[PDB]
Structures are given as structure tokens and as C-alpha cells.
Write a protein that binds this ligand. Structure first.
Ligand SMILES: [Mg+2]
Ligand SMILES: [Mg+2]
Lengths: 34, 52, 324, 141, 109
RNA sequence: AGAGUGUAGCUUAAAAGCACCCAACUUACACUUAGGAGAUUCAAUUGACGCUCUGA
RNA sequence: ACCUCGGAGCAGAACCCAACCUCCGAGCAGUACAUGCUAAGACUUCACCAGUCAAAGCGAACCUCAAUUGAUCCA
């Protein structure tokens, strides 16, 4: 079983990793094009 | 190969319809519509008319 | 013979030897989107449609969205798929912001403009809240084309349009019993002093809707005109006949349609009472008559036809004996 | 009686007259193409990258009713405009708009994956509970 | 060595060209494959024959082809189609002539 | 010093559509479902904050 | 050698077209037991016989296949 607080923390973890790897891919593509 | 079998209504009506089945399969029972009863009833194979 | 195409043939520009390099629709969804867009686009060949056819606001909205995002509970419910929306607040905001446009779309679909104004359109900028008082307790609202029975519409409705000289008109669009291109006027309150409606001039007293039995669904429109400057206006059915197009042609300079609200009514027992007592007439009863079935010209020798062929053409089913 | 002068044939010009009477034609063809045109009103849901659109469109193509999360009124009351919550909320809004518009029956034509989608299921349930039946009556011949 | 091939012509093809008044049930075109696809108010039989579902005028048009999502072969063809490409097929429509009916005064109660 | 000038990556889009990413199904890709962030450089059509080019 | 049926060329485009011309095949199989009943209107292998499709309706649920066959009488 699990709890509401840890579910919310996991969702925020997914959100922040989405942002982080979005920035990673953006910088990778910028270097590619440059 | 298949055989033609006369499926007869279990509803007591003398309603028969011919169907086909494998010669090597067990005797065949279906739920077929009986116009005399106006309802789907059980039909059981009775005889083999011919082998097709 | 090969006549050249009369225009750009489809799939012509893209066609090139680099098929492998070209990206492809990997999804039926994207293919369907493109196909629908192409179908909407006009074409030179025969087609189905031919035959059957500010900154402050942005800043405030962005701040509100940021506040909603910051509110953790909102995100909690959104990710737990349990959040809801205030329907009443959404409805009010829709009325304030984008309600007039959707109401205009509804009127165009129902054909109010093509009938009331012969095609001329107008955005109902001013919301119009009309409701027929049901009992002494409740009241049926008339939003746009909804259904209100003549029993409910027996007594005149309450109108609350928020503004600060107006003319309100109830027009039945398809209830005319003698003229296809004609209207019925039910009540016309002119020179209304703002929000309050009881002080308006009763040009024509209120007459409840009377859609004839078996005559189908009838549509009734509340037209509200803002009156730039006050102007003078000019149970018998001959005088209850009306032409809103001509009326607005006469009063166009001083009138501007700013509110609209309509509803649909079908026959009821109150219609029978309206016809017999108020109008003092025999109520007309209409029936939907489909065209007679088509049969080919009877042949002397109906080759290969079933025995029912003769029955298809006999008129009387009872036996007949001729001279005998 | 002058008031009793009634034309022998009545001319009801309401576009929805025969549709409500369940007698109007509905295109029965297009059996090799999708979606079917055999309807009077269609519920069309468009899931874009950022937004969600829900249209009630007559067979002739006219968009009778619309409900977009792009409108301020609706987008100012939900966190994300591209989630199951957004789909359910816009479905409820469309149901209310349909009831006030007089539209009670429609034909929803989803693809298999759209039908299996949780968001589409929530939208359909929202319309059903709002009082819209996603199954039009059979035409009367 | 070569036997068979004595079959006669099916006499298939278009039975009603464009502009022809067609009554409900009339067969518009008989085909072995889907040469002409069914349009508005045109039904398909088991043998791909097109019949008029309404009484009206036959019209042939070119319309975008969007197969049913469960038509696996056509869906695969679409999935392999390049972006920007749209399939077109010849459709047969029956533009109904008469209205569904009229409202007539039957009784002056 | 001078010219082109200017919406998140692209848009003869007007705050949108395509793009784009991870989570699950896939060996994997793709599809699909779930989610994710995103911009009209600043002041009154005009001037000046950032990029490209022409020179030293 | 062939005799009946179907598909493709000859016969490029409505239909139809011969050949002891060129090539492929068929004389089933599978699934279902409403593969039930009725019924407008149509197609038709150039006759007839035969063979096809099918709206609406009742009753219900919520056929694939190119050929894949054979009349009458009589049992
Ligand atoms: Mg041949
Ligand atoms: Mg013939």
C-alpha cells in the first residue's frame, strides 16, 4: 500500500524530471544545430 | 469431411432444420429459433440425412 | 484522349523519388486530420459539398493560471483525476465573455437570421434572461431553443436583461396557419425604461403560444432591441400576423438588436384551450403525410414477378364481382 | 370565421422540426468510409497538444454547439487544460450547453483507441449524467 | 492444354449515370471490386453493388478516403502513406428530390 | 559606424496548430493512453533592448 | 484432346464479343446456428430456365469465399 503524500511527491518528481530532461534535450539539440 | 444432420427442436414442436457438422465431432446441440414457439430453443441432432 | 487537369492534382507537390526520406503518417488520427482538412478545402472537381452543401486581459489571465498552478490542492486533484469545475461560474463567465457568439451560432443554425432578418446577422451582445413562471414556486428558463410547453408558457414571462430604452418582441416563426412566409406577434413591449420591464408600453398583449397539433415543433424568438431614441409604434389573428423583417426595416435607424433568446414549443392541451376560448376557433389538426409509394407502370405480363405484383396495384382489398 | 382560415398544407420552417419528430432523412451511405454520416447531430472531440475541443455538429456541417478549454470562462477554473479532468469538465459544460440548446440526442463516433481512452470515457459519462444520450433515435419511415 | 476461360461477361458496371433520376432500391452500379464507393444515400450489397437508398439524382464525385479504423489493410496503407498525401475515391451520391413529407390539415377540431 | 530587423524549434496563427520529452505497451521503433513545460524584448503606428550581415 | 463453372488478357475507356487461342483455377472449406420471417425497388451472363442485390416492417441481438453446381419426373 501507499499514501497520498508519497504519491504527490512521486508526481512532482516526474514533473521535475520532465523539466530537467526537457532542458537537457534542448541544449543537446542546440549544440547539434550550432 | 462433413455430414448433413437434421436438428430437431426439443420444444416438442416437430420443427426440424438441416445443418452441417464434422463426421468426427460429437452429436450436435444448438440454440436455434423455433418459429412455432417464437423463441430460441434447444435443438439436438437426430439423424444424418447425407454425407457432404 | 487525356484532358489535362483543370488545377493542382492532389498528392502532386509531395510526390518525389525520396519516398523513403519523406516522413509518413504513422497514425490514423493524423491522417484523418489531414484528410478532413483537405475535404474542407475547396476543389475544382465535383465534390459532396457542391451537391449537398487586451494585454491587461492576457496579464490577468496568466496571473490567474499561475495562482491555480501554485495552489497545490488544485494540482493534487488534477493528478488524482478528482478535480471538478464550478458549472454556475463557468456559465456566467461564458455569458459575459463568449456567450453572444455561441448564441449567434445557435440562432444561425436554427435559421432565425435567415427568417427573422432574411440573412442579416447580429451578435446578441446583451444577455437576455427570460423565464416563464411555473406555478407560484419555480420558473422554466428560455436559454436558446430549449423546449417549453405552452402550458408553462401560458402566462407572460419574467425578463431580466442587465442594462441601463429597449423594445422586447416575442415572435413565433413557423406558427402561421395561412402564410408560409409570415410571423405571429405574441407581445411587444416598446420603450421599456431599462432593466424594469413592467413599465414598457404594451403595444400588443401577451398571447400564449399555440402550436397546432401534429404540426411539428415551432420556434419562438425573444428579440430585444436597444432603442437609441424613443419612438412611437404605429385576439384577432389577422392583426396578430406580423413581419419582423418589415418591422425592423421601418425601425432600423432607432433600433439595434442587442438581445436574443428563443425556445421550441409543441402542441399541448393549453393549445386546445387557447384555440377554443381565446381565439374562438376550431383548433386545426395537422398530420405528417408521406408521399405515396412509387410503383413502376403495371405490365400486362409481369414476368418473374411474385403474385404480390397484382396486389401492389389493386386499390381496394375487398372482393369485387363486376357485372355479377 | 376569418380566424379559421387555415392553409391546407402547413409549412414548418424550423430546421429541427423533422429531426425532433424523428422523421428527417439521415445519410445512410458511406459504408466504406469513416465516420458514418447516419446521424442528425454528432459529438466530435478534438484533443490537440494543449487544448480540448468538444463540438455538437449537425450532419450538414454546421457547428450547433461548441465547448473549448480555450475559452477564458472554462480555462480559468482548472489546473491543466489537456488532462482527464479537463475532458470531464468540458464534457459537463457541453452537456449543460446542449440541454439549454435543446439537443438531447447525439451520435458519438470514436475510434477504438479513443473509446478505450479514460478521458473519452469520462467525457461520455459526463454527458450522460448531464442528460445527453449519445445514441440518436431511429428514423421513422 | 488450356481449358476453361469460357465464362461469359458479368454485364457489370454503371446502371445509372450522373443526372439520372433513381428510385429507392434501384441498383446504380454493379462491380466486382470497389471501383465506385458508396456515397450519401447509397448502400452496398454483399456483392459490392451500389443501390439507391433514396429517390433522387445520381451524382459522381471525388472524395477523400478515410477507411474505418478496423479495416486493417487500408489502415496499414495509410500508415505507410507519406505525410501530406490524401487518398481520393469516386463516390456515388443520391441527392433526394422529394421531401420526407408534408403536414396536411386533416381535421378542423 | 551602417543595413535587415524581432511570437517557446517552425508557422503570408491570431496568445493557437504542429513540433518536442518522460511514464506504461513494445528487444526496440512506431501507434495508443497518461502526464510536462513552454513565448509575442522594453516604452509611447513610432523610439530604444537582443540576433544576423556589411567594416575597422 | 475437349464438353459444366469462375478470374485475367485478346476485348487499354458503358455493356457485349470467337477461337482444337494464351494463362490460371472450381466441383470446397471455414464460421455460425435469427446462416429467421416478410417486403418496396432494382440487376441479370444477351431468350427462357436459372441466378443476383435490397430499403422499410415483424421478430431478434445491442456470414467469409470468384467459381465451389444439376431442372423435371420419380424415389
Ligand atoms: Mg474471359
Ligand atoms: Mg436478361
Amino acid at each position: 500500500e501507499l499514501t497520498f503524500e508519497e504519491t504527490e511527491r512521486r508526481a512532482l518528481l516526474l514533473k521535475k524530471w520532465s523539466l530537467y530532461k526537457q532542458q537537457e534535450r534542448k541544449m543537446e539539440r542546440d549544440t547539434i544545430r550550432a | 469431411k462433413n455430414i448433413l444432420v437434421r436438428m430437431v427442436s426439443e420444444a416438442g414442436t416437430g420443427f426440424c432444420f438441416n445443418t452441417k457438422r464434422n463426421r468426427l465431432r460429437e452429436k450436435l446441440t444448438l440454440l436455434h429459433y423455433d418459429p412455432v414457439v417464437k423463441q430460441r430453443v434447444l435443438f439436438v441432432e437426430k439423424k444424418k440425412i447425407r454425407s457432404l | 484522349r487525356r484532358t489535362p487537369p483543370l488545377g493542382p492534382m492532389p498528392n502532386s507537390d509531395i510526390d518525389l523519388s525520396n519516398l523513403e526520406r519523406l516522413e509518413k503518417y504513422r497514425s490514423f488520427d493524423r491522417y484523418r486530420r489531414r484528410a478532413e482538412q483537405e475535404a474542407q478545402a475547396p476543389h475544382w472537381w465535383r465534390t459532396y459539398r457542391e451537391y449537398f452543401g487586451r494585454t491587461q486581459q492576457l496579464l490577468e489571465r496568466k496571473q490567474a493560471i499561475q495562482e491555480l498552478r501554485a495552489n497545490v490542492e488544485e494540482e493534487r486533484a488534477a493528478r488524482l483525476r478528482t478535480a471538478s469545475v464550478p458549472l454556475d461560474a463557468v456559465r456566467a463567465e461564458w455569458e459575459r465573455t463568449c456567450g453572444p457568439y455561441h448564441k449567434q451560432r445557435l440562432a444561425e443554425y436554427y435559421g432565425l437570421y435567415r427568417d427573422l432578418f432574411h440573412g442579416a446577422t447580429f451578435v446578441p451582445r446583451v444577455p437576455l434572461h427570460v423565464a416563464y413562471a411555473v406555478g407560484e414556486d419555480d420558473l422554466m428558463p428560455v436559454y436558446c431553443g430549449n423546449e417549453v410547453t405552452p402550458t408553462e408558457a401560458a402566462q407572460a414571462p419574467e425578463v431580466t436583461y442587465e442594462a441601463e430604452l429597449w423594445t422586447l418582441l416575442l415572435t413565433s416563426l413557423d406558427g402561421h396557419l395561412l402564410e408560409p412566409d409570415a410571423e405571429y406577434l405574441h407581445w411587444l413591449l416598446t420603450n421599456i425604461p431599462g432593466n424594469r420591464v413592467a413599465e414598457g408600453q404594451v403595444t400588443c398583449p401577451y398571447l400564449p403560444p399555440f402550436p397546432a397539433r401534429g404540426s411539428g415543433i415551432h420556434r419562438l424568438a425573444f428579440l430585444l432591441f436597444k432603442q437609441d431614441q424613443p419612438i412611437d409604434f404605429s385576439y384577432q389573428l389577422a392583426q396578430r400576423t406580423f413581419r419582423t423583417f418589415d418591422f425592423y426595416k421601418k425601425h432600423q435607424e432607432t433600433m439595434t438588436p442587442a438581445g436574443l433568446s428563443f425556445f421550441q414549443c409543441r402542441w399541448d392541451d393549453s393549445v386546445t384551450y387557447i384555440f377554443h376560448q381565446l381565439l374562438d376557433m376550431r383548433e386545426p389538426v395537422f398530420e405528417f403525410v408521406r408521399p405515396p409509394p412509387y410503383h413502376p407502370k403495371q405490365k400486362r405480363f409481369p414476368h418473374r414477378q411474385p403474385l404480390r405484383y397484382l396486389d401492389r396495384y389493386r386499390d381496394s382489398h375487398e372482393p369485387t364481382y363486376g357485372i355479377y | 370565421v376569418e380566424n379559421e382560415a387555415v392553409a391546407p398544407e402547413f409549412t414548418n420552417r424550423n430546421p429541427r422540426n423533422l429531426e425532433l419528430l424523428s422523421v428527417a432523412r439521415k445519410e445512410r451511405g458511406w459504408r466504406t468510409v469513416f465516420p458514418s454520416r447516419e446521424f442528425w447531430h454528432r459529438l466530435r472531440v478534438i484533443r490537440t497538444q494543449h487544448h480540448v475541443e468538444a463540438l455538437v455538429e449537425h450532419q450538414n456541417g454546421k457547428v450547433v454547439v461548441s465547448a473549448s478549454t480555450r475559452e477564458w470562462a472554462i480555462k480559468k477554473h482548472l489546473y491543466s487544460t489537456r488532462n482527464v479532468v479537463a475532458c470531464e469538465s468540458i464534457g459537463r459544460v457541453l452537456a449543460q450547453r446542449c440541454l439549454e440548446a435543446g439537443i438531447n440526442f447525439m451520435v458519438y463516433q470514436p475510434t477504438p483507441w479513443e473509446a478505450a481512452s479514460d478521458s473519452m470515457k469520462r467525457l461520455q459519462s459526463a454527458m450522460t449524467e448531464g442528460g445527453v444520450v449519445l445514441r440518436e433515435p431511429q428514423r421513422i419511415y | 492444354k488450356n481449358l476453361g476461360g469460357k465464362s461469359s461477361g458479368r454485364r457489370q458496371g454503371i446502371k445509372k449515370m450522373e443526372g439520372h433520376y433513381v428510385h429507392a432500391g434501384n441498383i446504380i452500379a454493379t462491380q466486382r471490386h470497389f471501383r465506385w464507393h458508396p456515397g450519401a444515400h447509397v448502400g452496398v450489397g454483399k456483392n459490392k453493388c451500389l443501390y439507391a437508398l433514396e429517390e433522387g439524382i445520381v451524382r459522381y464525385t471525388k472524395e477523400v478516403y478515410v477507411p474505418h479504423p478496423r479495416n486493417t489493410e487500408a489502415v496499414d496503407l495509410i500508415t505507410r502513406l507519406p505525410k501530406g498525401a490524401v487518398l481520393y475515391k469516386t463516390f456515388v451520391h443520391v441527392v433526394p428530390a422529394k421531401p420526407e413529407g408534408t403536414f396536411k390539415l386533416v381535421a378542423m377540431l
